[PDB]
Amino acid sequence: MGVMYFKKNEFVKAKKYLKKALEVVKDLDPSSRTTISIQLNLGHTYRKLNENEIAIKCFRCVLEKNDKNSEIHCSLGYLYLKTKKLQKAIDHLHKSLYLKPNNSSATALLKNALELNVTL
Amino acid sequence: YNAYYGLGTSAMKLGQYEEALLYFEKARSINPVNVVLICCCGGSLEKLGYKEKALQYYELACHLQPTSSLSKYKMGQLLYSMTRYNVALQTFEELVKLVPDDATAHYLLGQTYRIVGRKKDAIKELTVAMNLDPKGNQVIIDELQKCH
Amino acid sequence: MIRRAPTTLQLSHDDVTSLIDDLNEQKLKQ
Amino acid sequence: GINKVLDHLAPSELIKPVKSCHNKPSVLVLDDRIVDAATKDLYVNGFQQNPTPENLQHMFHQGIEILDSARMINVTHLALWKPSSFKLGNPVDFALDDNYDTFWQSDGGQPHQLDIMFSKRMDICVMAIFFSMIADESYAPSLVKVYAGHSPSDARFYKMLEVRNVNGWVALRFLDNREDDQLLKCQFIRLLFPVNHENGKDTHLRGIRLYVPSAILR
Numbered sequence: 001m002g003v004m005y006f007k008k009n010e011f012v013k014a015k016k017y018l019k020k021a022l023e024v025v026k027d028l029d030p031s032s033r034t035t036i037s038i039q040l041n042l043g044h045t046y047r048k049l050n051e052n053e054i055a056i057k058c059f060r061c062v063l064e065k066n067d068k069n070s071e072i073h074c075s076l077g078y079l080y081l082k083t084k085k086l087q088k089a090i091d092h093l094h095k096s097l098y099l100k101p102n103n104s105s106a107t108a109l110l111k112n113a114l115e116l117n118v119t120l
Numbered sequence: 121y122n123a124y125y126g127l128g129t130s131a132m133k134l135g136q137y138e139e140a141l142l143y144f145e146k147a148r149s150i151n152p153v154n155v156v157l158i159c160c161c162g163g164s165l166e167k168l169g170y171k172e173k174a175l176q177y178y179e180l181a182c183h184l185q186p187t188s189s190l191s192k193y194k195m196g197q198l199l200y201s202m203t204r205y206n207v208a209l210q211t212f213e214e215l216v217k218l219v220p221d222d223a224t225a226h227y228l229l230g231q232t233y234r235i236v237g238r239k240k241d242a243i244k245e246l247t248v249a250m251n252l253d254p255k256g257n258q259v260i261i262d263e264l265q266k267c268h
Numbered sequence: 269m270i271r272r273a274p275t276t277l278q279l280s281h282d283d284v285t286s287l288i289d290d291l292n293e294q295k296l297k298q
Numbered sequence: 299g300i301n302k303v304l305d306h307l308a309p310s311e312l313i314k315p316v317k318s319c320h321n322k323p324s325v326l327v328l329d330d331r332i333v334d335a336a337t338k339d340l341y342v343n344g345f346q347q348n349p350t351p352e353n354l355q356h357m358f359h360q361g362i363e364i365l366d367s368a369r370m371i372n373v374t375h376l377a378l379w380k381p382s383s384f385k386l387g388n389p390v391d392f393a394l395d396d397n398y399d400t401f402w403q404s405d406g407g408q409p410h411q412l413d414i415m416f417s418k419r420m421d422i423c424v425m426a427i428f429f430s431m432i433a434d435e436s437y438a439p440s441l442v443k444v445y446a447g448h449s450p451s452d453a454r455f456y457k458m459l460e461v462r463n464v465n466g467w468v469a470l471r472f473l474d475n476r477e478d479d480q481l482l483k484c485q486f487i488r489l490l491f492p493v494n495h496e497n498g499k500d501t502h503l504r505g506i507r508l509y510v511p512s513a514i515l516r
Binding site: 003006033034037038040041044045048071074075078081082104105108109112116119 | 273274275276277278279281283284287288291292295
């Protein structure tokens with residue numbers, strides 16, 4: 001329900017439904033590819049909801065539970081470059097390039113982050 | 121910082137001067153205490169066209185390391201390009217004091233002396249240059265008949 | 269029961285292009 | 299303005315002086331027994347009994363560094379190569395490996411062809427070929443004709459090369475086609491080896507290179 005409301009460009013009810021999904025599964029089974037999807041979709045909704053702090057928190061949680069994830073590191077680079085945390089942005093972006101050298105957007109993101117850091 | 125320096129060099133050899141400068145500034149920021157990183161970044165800046173900022177960075181480098189032969193070589197080259205031979209003279213003098221056994225220093229010292237106009241200094245330094253090395257004597261010979 | 273793998277949200281290229289552009293005019297502002 | 303530019307694109311009466319071309323194919327002399335300023339420009343290793351192969355391997359190197367000593371850009375590896383036929387022993391890699399010991403050998407019809415077709419428009423200026431009269435007399439290239447063109451469709455004759463005695467790198471800069479640019483502008487180059495010395499059959503190629511114009515930390 002959260003995913004379909006997100007796809008329907010109606011994020012507010014998607015956010016509440018994914019929050020309900022998280023709170024139902026919060027107490028049990030942190031592993032088993034369920035909490036991972038819940039937290040990832042919730043972080044995506046928050047980043048599309050323009051609220052970044054809790055999105056970064058959930059992305060950090062899933063990165064803790066799974067480090068082998070190029071998409072996660074690209075998302076952290078996105079969120080950190082949205083804010084002015086350039087060091088974390090470039091670190092996670094380099095991690096993503098390490099995870100997958102041939103990333104289309106990540107090259108441009110790295111160029112922009114380096115240019116902004118130098119000009120800062 | 122070694123990765124940053126390598127990226128800057130790789131951008132430099134391909135002609136992307138502004139990108140190479142972009143890497144080199146970060147390389148400096150990682151390790152503020154350096155000399156040849158300073159020199160390479162300043163060379164990138166003068167490739168951009170910012171000669172004054174390149175000179176300021178070069179002066180910061182020479183202040184940080186008073187004994188740096190390559191830095192002094194860069195001050196000499198840049199001052200020769202900018203027609204500041206009055207101070208370039210003492211730069212080459214201190215440089216040839218630092219390195220007495222290299223024919224390149226004698227060559228540039230004699231060339232600067234000839235440009236200034238001291239014929240005796242130019243001929244003496246060029247004679248030392250040919251005595252030290254015959255591999256590059258082709259240019260040294262030309263500097264001979266030009267002065268003579 | 270064979271539970272289906274839950275669908276996951278992806279970071280689209282359009283939104284990241286929009287954000288990098290917005291950052292470009294942001295730095296161009298001052 | 300429309301008319302005047304068309305006249306520039308299509309100069310009708312301005313160009314043709316007399317229409318009196320000889321129409322014969324010009325032949326280039328490669329002999330290294332005569333010393334001349336023009337020959338020294340095209341022949342690099344210098345005029346000289348037959349040197350032993352170790353001198354040939356030796357002189358193979360200074361000819362490389364002398365050609366590489368000048369301000370020049372090598373794009374020999376920036377194009378696709380397709381010879382007439384292989385012999386399953388050595389592809390054209392051993393011809394372009396810049397090693398005298400290794401070489402590429404073709405095996406097939408007598409008019410051997412070597413194709414050098416480019417991906418992008420690159421303006422070649424200096425053509426470098428190494429020959430070994432004494433090391434490879436049996437498979438020495440005696441007769442060389444270089445083509446030019448923008449495609450396999452429009453390949454056309456450019457120059458004539460008769461080989462009598464050359465143990466060394468041969469430099470071939472192009473001035474006839476463009477006197478203003480002093481360089482060649484084509485995307486498609488092919489070479490033919492229709493006959494060898496002393497009525498040979500096959501042909502090697504010790505060296506080949508392509509030239510175009512344009513302290514540290516570990």
